[PDB]
């Protein structure tokens, strides 16, 4: 019931300021530690800093070199982070997390889903989605030429999950990302059932549904 | 009520109340924030 | 700062094996240590928070041990759902520092991939470029060789591969390999095949398409 949600632009031009906010539900920001943690692609976890209201205290990891600021808004029950003068080292998935404590002990008991923030000069581009049309039969949706990450793909608006492999994106010589989402289905179902892939690439404000038929 | 700022005294912890530093017992103070081993932590009296 | 080192970096074990992750600090940290699980694509979730104390809802199979500098996470009976990277975290002194992660994967039986080939879209061919995807569905081990033969001419420098993370239930991997050509080069040739070599296959299985076959 207690949940957290990071929100903010997934694209920041370098030398400029990242801004994210974590909306909090099922708990009040007034009573525990609320921190940000980031994770560069394919690498580990770095604690950014926490904020605490009983003693009105913020701590920051010195690795951020005082570029980080953590704001609390008891009014709307969400707390935010800003990171200035960003470089590509600040490209990461940013998690907000609630930190519980007892005595000398501390831990992050619930985390947000996390939002990726690419630090890059480039401008956003939306993908083009082409089908991969088809006992057991495979079909899929090719999501080509977009920037930046991420792209989210679902089938039948969530009704189809067993058997889907949305592949990790690959970066082409153009600096544009591309990927495919496939699924295996009974060819019993090939003639009866309609199969649509729900591609969502919000860094470009793009939503497309493509039916994959023979 | 009175806010304390205790560290380990080199069961009992060496505190400050708001420029005088008073020594206290672990049991009659209550942590307000996460306790830090080396540095200071802010407590409040079991009396409040 | 307190350096945190997990060992090993990676490990593979059979379902029902017992596996222990080690995490060593550069100072004594008085059991101020918490273990987290991060399945691929998800945020971490808490497992253990005071070296020993297991979080509610977490499985009895996860156990936390250690004192001073040396700390272990033990998975009593490795289940297939435990595919994840595992993180230790010290809260003895700010800045709180994470371990570098330990990736856990399942050693399972050999599974031959299901292979599928997908021609370029006509929707995509009108863009001036054509993509052909050859799909290795659910196999183990992850090692595979996928050659592209166009008119039985092996191709090199043309294609790009992508691999899913190990499956939560299957303990298998999926692999994409897409060959991208001009629409001039694509129509200048006849048959396109991918040949798949794998430990589960007696001989390299090939699946092909002829331009305009249906
Ligand atoms: C106790 O409190 C004050 C903190 O300012 C300090 O001057 C003193 O050295 C401390 N000594 C011991 C033994 O705790
Ligand atoms: Na602590």
**Dihedral angle over CA of A85, A91, A92, A98, nearest 10:** 10
Which positions 13-52 of C are in contact with B (Cβ < 8 Å)?
30
Asked if A203 contacts A124 with a C-beta cutoff of 8 angstroms, the reply is: yes
* Numbered ranges of CATH 2.60.40.10 in chain C: 4-106, 115-210
Say if A107 is an interface residue toward chain B (CB within 8 Å). no
Inspect the interface and report whether the beta carbons of A104 and B33 lie closer than 8 Å: no
**In the CATH scheme, what is the homologous superfamily, with its name and number, of domain C115-210?**
Immunoglobulins (2.60.40.10)
Measured in angstroms, the resolution is: 2.9
DSSP per-residue codes, A35-62: EEEEE-TTS--EEEEEEETTTTEEEE-G
Inspect the interface and report whether the beta carbons of B33 and A54 lie closer than 8 Å: yes
Nearest residue CA, atom 7 of ligand 1? Answer: B21
State phi, psi for C181 to the nearest 5 degrees.
-130, 165
With a 6 A CB cut-off, is B9 part of the ligand 1 pocket? yes
Q: By what technique were these coordinates determined?
A: X-ray
Ligand 2 center from residue C96 Cα (angstroms)? 9
**Dihedral angle over CA of A43, A167, C19, C26, nearest 10:** 0
Say if A55 is an interface residue toward chain B (CB within 8 Å). yes
Nearest beta carbon to residue C162 from set A113, A136, A168: A168
Inspect the interface and report whether the beta carbons of A103 and B32 lie closer than 8 Å: no
Say if B34 is an interface residue toward chain C (CB within 8 Å). yes
Ligand 1 center from residue B17 Cα (angstroms)? 13
> Measured between alpha carbons, how far is residue A132 from residues A100, A141, A183, C117 in Å?
48, 5, 10, 9
Ligand nearest to the CA of B4: 1
For testing contact with chain A, the best of C99, C103, C118 (most A CBs within 10 A)? C118
Q: Which domain holds residue B34?
A: 3-45
State phi, psi for C38 to the nearest 5 degrees.
-130, 95
So what's the architecture of C4-106 in CATH? Sandwich (2.60)
Locate the chain A residue with the closest alpha carbon to B31.
A103
Asked if C181 contacts C128 with a C-beta cutoff of 8 angstroms, the reply is: no
Nearest beta carbon to residue A104 from set C32, C46, C123: C32
> Measured between alpha carbons, how far is residue C158 from residues C74, C130, C154, C182 in Å?
45, 12, 10, 11
Atom of ligand 1 minimally distant from the CA of B9 = 14
DSSP per-residue codes, A69-130: EEEEETTTTEEEEEE-S--GGG-EEEEEEEEEEETTEEEEEEE---EEEEE-SSPPB--EEE
Q: β-strand C159-163 against C153-155: which pairing, if any?
A: unpaired
Asked if A82 contacts A66 with a C-beta cutoff of 8 angstroms, the reply is: no
* Chain C residues with beta carbon closer than 8 angstroms to that of B8: none
Asked if C11 contacts C105 with a C-beta cutoff of 8 angstroms, the reply is: yes
Q: Please name which of C3, C5, C51 lies closest in space to residue C27, comparing C-alpha atoms.
A: C3
With a 6 A CB cut-off, is B14 part of the ligand 1 pocket? yes
Determine the Cα–Cα distance for residues C45 and C32; give it in Å rounded to an integer.
17
Ligand 2 center from residue B21 Cα (angstroms)? 24
Ligand nearest to the CA of B12: 1
Inspect the interface and report whether the beta carbons of A104 and B32 lie closer than 8 Å: no
With a 6 A CB cut-off, is B18 part of the ligand 1 pocket? no
Q: Please name which of C140, C191, C192, C188 lies closest in space to residue C163, comparing C-alpha atoms.
A: C140
Inspect the interface and report whether the beta carbons of C133 and A133 lie closer than 8 Å: no
Helix locations, C86-191, DSSP H: 122-125, 183-187
CA C116 to chain centre: 21
Determine the Cα–Cα distance for residues A7 and A117; give it in Å rounded to an integer.
10
Looking at the structure of chain B, the number of domains it has is: 1
With a 6 A CB cut-off, is B21 part of the ligand 1 pocket? yes
> Measured between alpha carbons, how far is residue C87 from residues A19, A90, C117 in Å?
26, 20, 39
Domains of chain A and any CATH numbers: 3-119 (2.60.40.10), 128-211 (2.60.40.10)
Inspect the interface and report whether the beta carbons of A95 and C44 lie closer than 8 Å: yes
With a 6 A CB cut-off, is B10 part of the ligand 1 pocket? yes
């Amino acid at each position: 019931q207690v949940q957290l949600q990071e929100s903010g632009p997934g694209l920041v031009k370098p030398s400029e300021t990242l801004s994210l906010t974590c909306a909090v539900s099922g708990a009040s920001i007034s009573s525990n530690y609320w921190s940000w943690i980031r994770q560069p692609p394919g690498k580990g976890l770095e604690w950014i800093g926490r904020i605490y209201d009983p003693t009105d205290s913020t701590d920051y990891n010195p690795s951020l070199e005082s570029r980080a600021t953590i704001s609390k808004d008891t009014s709307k029950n969400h707390f935010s982070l800003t990171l200035s003068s960003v470089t590509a080292a600040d490209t990461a998935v940013y998690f907000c997390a609630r930190g519980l404590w007892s005595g000398y002990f501390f831990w992050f008991d619930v985390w947000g889903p996390g939002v990726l923030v690419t630090v890059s000069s480039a401008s956003t581009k939306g993908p083009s989605v082409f089908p991969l049309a088809p006992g057991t039969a495979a079909l899929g949706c090719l999501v080509k030429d977009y920037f930046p990450e991420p792209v989210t793909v679902s089938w039948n608006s969530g009704a189809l999950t067993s058997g889907v492999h949305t592949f990790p994106a690959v970066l082409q010589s153009s600096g544009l990302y591309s990927l495919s989402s496939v699924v295996t289905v009974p060819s019993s179902s090939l003639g009866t059932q309609t199969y649509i892939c729900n591609v969502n690439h919000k860094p470009s404000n793009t939503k497309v549904d493509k039916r994959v038929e023979p | 009520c009175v806010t304390l700022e205790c560290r380990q005294v080199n069961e009992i912890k060496n505190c400050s109340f708001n420029k005088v530093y008073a020594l206290f017992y672990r049991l009659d103070i209550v942590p307000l924030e996460e306790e830090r081993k080396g540095n200071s932590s802010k407590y409040r009296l079991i009396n409040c | 700062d307190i350096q945190m080192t997990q060992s090993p970096s990676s490990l593979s074990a059979s379902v029902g094996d017992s596996v222990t992750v080690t995490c060593r600090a550069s100072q004594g940290i008085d059991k101020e240590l918490s273990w987290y699980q991060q399945k691929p694509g998800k945020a971490p979730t808490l497992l253990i928070y005071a070296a020993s104390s297991l979080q509610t809802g977490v499985s009895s199979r996860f156990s936390g041990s250690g004192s001073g500098t040396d700390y272990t996470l033990t998975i009593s009976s490795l289940q297939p759902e435990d595919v994840a990277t595992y993180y230790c975290l010290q809260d003895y002194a700010t800045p709180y520092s994470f371990g570098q992660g330990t990736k856990v994967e399942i050693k399972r039986t050999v599974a031959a991939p299901s292979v599928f080939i997908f021609p370029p879209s006509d929707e995509q061919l009108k863009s001036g470029t054509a993509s052909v995807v050859c799909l290795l569905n659910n196999f183990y081990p992850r090692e595979a060789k996928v050659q592209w033969k166009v008119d039985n001419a092996l191709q090199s420098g043309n294609s790009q591969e992508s691999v899913t993370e190990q499956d939560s239930k299957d303990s298998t991997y999926s692999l994409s390999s897409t060959l991208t050509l001009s629409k001039a080069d694509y129509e200048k040739h006849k048959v396109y095949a991918c040949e798949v070599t794998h430990q589960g296959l007696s001989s390299p299985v090939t699946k092909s398409f002829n331009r305009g076959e249906c």
